Design an enzyme around this catalytic site. Structure first.
Site, PDB file in Angstrom:
ATOM      1  N   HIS A  92      16.156 -22.386 -11.906  1.00  0.00           N
ATOM      2  CA  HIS A  92      16.321 -23.784 -12.569  1.00  0.00           C
ATOM      3  C   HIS A  92      17.919 -23.884 -12.507  1.00  0.00           C
ATOM      4  O   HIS A  92      18.416 -24.812 -12.120  1.00  0.00           O
ATOM      5  CB  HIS A  92      15.419 -24.179 -13.601  1.00  0.00           C
ATOM      6  CG  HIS A  92      13.976 -23.906 -13.006  1.00  0.00           C
ATOM      7  ND1 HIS A  92      13.472 -24.649 -12.162  1.00  0.00           N
ATOM      8  CD2 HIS A  92      13.058 -23.452 -13.696  1.00  0.00           C
ATOM      9  CE1 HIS A  92      12.320 -24.509 -12.023  1.00  0.00           C
ATOM     10  NE2 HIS A  92      11.996 -23.672 -13.012  1.00  0.00           N
TER      11      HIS A  92
ATOM     12  N   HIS B 207      23.048 -23.164 -21.082  1.00  0.00           N
ATOM     13  CA  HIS B 207      23.072 -23.486 -19.493  1.00  0.00           C
ATOM     14  C   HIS B 207      23.503 -24.378 -19.216  1.00  0.00           C
ATOM     15  O   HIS B 207      23.951 -25.307 -19.895  1.00  0.00           O
ATOM     16  CB  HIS B 207      21.453 -23.292 -19.004  1.00  0.00           C
ATOM     17  CG  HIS B 207      20.649 -24.418 -19.695  1.00  0.00           C
ATOM     18  ND1 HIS B 207      20.033 -24.555 -21.203  1.00  0.00           N
ATOM     19  CD2 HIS B 207      20.665 -25.898 -19.181  1.00  0.00           C
ATOM     20  CE1 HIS B 207      19.624 -25.916 -21.346  1.00  0.00           C
ATOM     21  NE2 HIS B 207      20.026 -26.760 -20.178  1.00  0.00           N
TER      22      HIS B 207
ATOM     23  N   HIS C  43      23.857 -27.754 -15.896  1.00  0.00           N
ATOM     24  CA  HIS C  43      23.291 -28.878 -14.905  1.00  0.00           C
ATOM     25  C   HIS C  43      24.440 -29.154 -14.022  1.00  0.00           C
ATOM     26  O   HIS C  43      25.594 -29.418 -14.462  1.00  0.00           O
ATOM     27  CB  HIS C  43      22.514 -29.958 -15.472  1.00  0.00           C
ATOM     28  CG  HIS C  43      21.350 -29.539 -16.314  1.00  0.00           C
ATOM     29  ND1 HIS C  43      20.268 -29.409 -15.849  1.00  0.00           N
ATOM     30  CD2 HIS C  43      21.444 -29.186 -17.568  1.00  0.00           C
ATOM     31  CE1 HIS C  43      19.492 -29.026 -16.841  1.00  0.00           C
ATOM     32  NE2 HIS C  43      19.952 -29.045 -18.221  1.00  0.00           N
TER      33      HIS C  43
ATOM     34  N   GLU D  48      23.624 -34.925 -16.695  1.00  0.00           N
ATOM     35  CA  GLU D  48      22.112 -35.605 -16.962  1.00  0.00           C
ATOM     36  C   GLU D  48      22.444 -36.839 -17.529  1.00  0.00           C
ATOM     37  O   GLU D  48      22.101 -37.747 -17.155  1.00  0.00           O
ATOM     38  CB  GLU D  48      21.201 -34.816 -17.651  1.00  0.00           C
ATOM     39  CG  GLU D  48      21.153 -33.206 -17.008  1.00  0.00           C
ATOM     40  CD  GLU D  48      19.888 -32.453 -17.127  1.00  0.00           C
ATOM     41  OE1 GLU D  48      19.764 -32.257 -18.367  1.00  0.00           O
ATOM     42  OE2 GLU D  48      19.085 -32.416 -16.432  1.00  0.00           O
TER      43      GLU D  48
ATOM     44  N   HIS E  69      24.795 -27.425 -21.920  1.00  0.00           N
ATOM     45  CA  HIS E  69      23.588 -27.595 -23.041  1.00  0.00           C
ATOM     46  C   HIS E  69      23.668 -26.247 -23.873  1.00  0.00           C
ATOM     47  O   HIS E  69      23.002 -25.361 -23.200  1.00  0.00           O
ATOM     48  CB  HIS E  69      22.239 -27.999 -22.409  1.00  0.00           C
ATOM     49  CG  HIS E  69      22.259 -29.221 -21.660  1.00  0.00           C
ATOM     50  ND1 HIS E  69      20.944 -29.646 -20.803  1.00  0.00           N
ATOM     51  CD2 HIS E  69      23.141 -30.271 -21.862  1.00  0.00           C
ATOM     52  CE1 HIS E  69      21.312 -30.805 -20.686  1.00  0.00           C
ATOM     53  NE2 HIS E  69      22.488 -31.393 -21.257  1.00  0.00           N
TER      54      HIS E  69
ATOM     55  N   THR F 186      15.031 -31.953 -21.105  1.00  0.00           N
ATOM     56  CA  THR F 186      15.335 -32.540 -19.726  1.00  0.00           C
ATOM     57  C   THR F 186      14.588 -31.920 -18.666  1.00  0.00           C
ATOM     58  O   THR F 186      14.744 -32.363 -17.571  1.00  0.00           O
ATOM     59  CB  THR F 186      16.673 -32.763 -19.493  1.00  0.00           C
ATOM     60  OG1 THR F 186      17.092 -31.562 -19.127  1.00  0.00           O
ATOM     61  CG2 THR F 186      17.463 -33.452 -20.604  1.00  0.00           C
TER      62      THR F 186
HETATM   63  N1  LIG Z   1      17.805 -29.181 -20.461  1.00  0.00           N
HETATM   64  S1  LIG Z   1      17.632 -28.920 -21.975  1.00  0.00           S
HETATM   65  O1  LIG Z   1      18.642 -28.447 -23.096  1.00  0.00           O
HETATM   66  O2  LIG Z   1      16.959 -30.154 -22.491  1.00  0.00           O
HETATM   67  C1  LIG Z   1      16.409 -27.642 -22.365  1.00  0.00           C
HETATM   68  C2  LIG Z   1      16.500 -26.594 -23.336  1.00  0.00           C
HETATM   69  C3  LIG Z   1      15.677 -25.793 -23.194  1.00  0.00           C
HETATM   70  C4  LIG Z   1      14.657 -25.656 -22.554  1.00  0.00           C
HETATM   71  C5  LIG Z   1      13.330 -24.416 -22.646  1.00  0.00           C
HETATM   72  N2  LIG Z   1      12.362 -24.814 -23.630  1.00  0.00           N
HETATM   73  C6  LIG Z   1      12.543 -25.326 -25.195  1.00  0.00           C
HETATM   74  C7  LIG Z   1      12.908 -24.222 -25.996  1.00  0.00           C
HETATM   75  C8  LIG Z   1      14.140 -23.936 -26.395  1.00  0.00           C
HETATM   76  C9  LIG Z   1      14.645 -22.852 -26.924  1.00  0.00           C
HETATM   77  C10 LIG Z   1      13.870 -21.693 -27.181  1.00  0.00           C
HETATM   78  C11 LIG Z   1      12.328 -21.934 -26.721  1.00  0.00           C
HETATM   79  O3  LIG Z   1      11.472 -20.939 -26.939  1.00  0.00           O
HETATM   80  C12 LIG Z   1      10.333 -20.943 -27.373  1.00  0.00           C
HETATM   81  C13 LIG Z   1       9.336 -21.991 -26.066  1.00  0.00           C
HETATM   82  O4  LIG Z   1       8.780 -21.277 -25.220  1.00  0.00           O
HETATM   83  O5  LIG Z   1       9.254 -23.277 -26.389  1.00  0.00           O
HETATM   84  C14 LIG Z   1      12.045 -23.178 -26.473  1.00  0.00           C
HETATM   85  S2  LIG Z   1      11.027 -24.468 -23.321  1.00  0.00           S
HETATM   86  O6  LIG Z   1      10.458 -24.873 -21.954  1.00  0.00           O
HETATM   87  O7  LIG Z   1      10.129 -24.519 -24.639  1.00  0.00           O
HETATM   88  C15 LIG Z   1      10.954 -22.605 -22.949  1.00  0.00           C
HETATM   89  C16 LIG Z   1      11.928 -22.012 -23.460  1.00  0.00           C
HETATM   90  C17 LIG Z   1      12.087 -20.706 -22.989  1.00  0.00           C
HETATM   91  C18 LIG Z   1      11.234 -20.052 -22.123  1.00  0.00           C
HETATM   92  N3  LIG Z   1      10.008 -20.690 -21.714  1.00  0.00           N
HETATM   93  C19 LIG Z   1       9.953 -21.944 -22.148  1.00  0.00           C
HETATM   94  C20 LIG Z   1      14.355 -26.583 -21.644  1.00  0.00           C
HETATM   95  C21 LIG Z   1      15.361 -27.510 -21.403  1.00  0.00           C
HETATM   96 ZN   LIG Z   2      19.754 -28.422 -20.170  1.00  0.00          ZN
END
Ligand SMILES: NS(=O)(=O)c1ccc(CN(Cc2cccc(OCC(=O)O)c2)S(=O)(=O)c2cccnc2)cc1
Ligand SMILES: [Zn+2]
Ligand SMILES: NS(=O)(=O)c1ccc(CN(Cc2cccc(OCC(=O)O)c2)S(=O)(=O)c2cccnc2)cc1
Length: 260
Positions: free
Chosen positions: A64, A94, A96, A106, A119, A198
């Site tokens: 991703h 990370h 985008h 974004e 982010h 996101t």
């Molecule tokens: N673009 S953005 O900044 O909005 C963004 C930021 C983070 C994420 C990831 N998720 C949230 C999260 C954030 C940190 C740690 C986390 O670990 C626990 C968990 O599995 O939820 C979870 S997540 O989809 O829940 C995830 C995390 C890690 C591995 N698999 C799934 C997606 C999008």
């Molecule tokens: Zn992000």
């Protein structure tokens, strides 16, 4: 289980709602930041980015984006103040980015897209771990930083120079001793609003803090992002570009400004 979402015509943001129905929710991110509508909020406490003890670990191509993770087993690199109550620990950052310098962010600012968006992802230590935090309405805080193309960002170069080693999905490399403070602009002026992840699962559990001042990166730096692959080793090459979700409806939300 069995995630096949992505960014293409056939699995991209317009499709996500079929497996992640919250995609059409009341608190989705990103959004367009109308700088005229956003109101200065004198009640916002000073924002505290405290990254001096950050411990970076690895860098990974997850198909991703690419992500740098941190040791968040103790309060080492934390975010406090601003709109936040209590302490949020940095877990990963990370990016985008786009196929061209005029797209990739974004969030947008008065509909302006930037070349990329950083982010820095934090979780609320009152919930004990990031998994639990990710399911609470005040569980996560993401510090978003825009990238514009101009002069090089020296603090980004160590990231750029490792990307050739993580070209394809599933590849990781050591990434210790990286200082994320080298990714910040001079000003911590920000906008804030309640939103979501996101990417799937799109949980509505994020306090967004979006810095007003973009960082400048060079054309050469962002070109290196665009050499990454969405695909795994010995799959057909699909360049990792345009891995951004477009702006979502603001619905019943107010964006607050930290500055006049
Ligand atoms: N673009 S953005 O900044 O909005 C963004 C930021 C983070 C994420 C990831 N998720 C949230 C999260 C954030 C940190 C740690 C986390 O670990 C626990 C968990 O599995 O939820 C979870 S997540 O989809 O829940 C995830 C995390 C890690 C591995 N698999 C799934 C997606 C999008
Ligand atoms: Zn992000
Ligand atoms: N979560 S979501 O609601 O956004 C969602 C979930 C599933 C799908 C369906 N796809 C099936 C498929 C099957 C085998 C592997 C896949 O992935 C390959 C890849 O990563 O390109 C995808 S698909 O239409 O065949 C496809 C293939 C390649 C690129 N785009 C789409 C679309 C949207």
């Amino acid at each position: 289980m069995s995630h096949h979402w992505g960014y293409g015509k056939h699995n991209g943001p317009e499709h996500w709602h079929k497996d992640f129905p919250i995609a059409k929710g009341e608190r989705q991110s990103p959004v367009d930041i109308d700088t005229h509508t956003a109101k200065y909020d004198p009640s916002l406490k000073p924002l505290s980015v405290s990254y001096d003890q950050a411990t970076s670990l690895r860098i990974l191509n997850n198909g991703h984006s690419f992500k740098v993770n941190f040791d968040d087993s103790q309060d080492k690199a934390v975010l406090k103040g601003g709109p936040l109550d209590g302490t949020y620990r940095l877990t990963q950052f990370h990016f985008h980015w786009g196929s061209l310098d005029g797209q990739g962010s974004e969030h947008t600012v008065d509909k302006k897209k930037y070349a990329a968006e950083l982010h820095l992802v934090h979780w609320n230590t009152k919930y004990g771990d990031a998994s639990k935090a990710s399911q609470q309405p005040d569980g996560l805080a993401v510090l978003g930083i825009f990238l514009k193309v101009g002069s090089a960002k020296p603090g980004l170069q160590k990231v750029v120079d490792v990307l050739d080693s993580i070209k394809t999905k599933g590849k990781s490399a050591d990434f210790t001793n990286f200082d994320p403070r080298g990714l910040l602009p001079e000003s911590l002026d920000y906008w804030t609003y309640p939103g979501s992840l996101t990417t799937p699962p799109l949980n509505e559990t994020v306090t967004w803090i979006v810095l007003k001042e973009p960082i400048s990166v060079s054309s050469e730096q962002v070109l290196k992002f665009r050499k990454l692959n969405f695909n795994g080793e010995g799959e057909p090459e699909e360049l990792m570009v345009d891995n951004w979700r477009p702006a979502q409806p603001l619905k019943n939300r107010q964006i607050k400004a930290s500055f006049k």
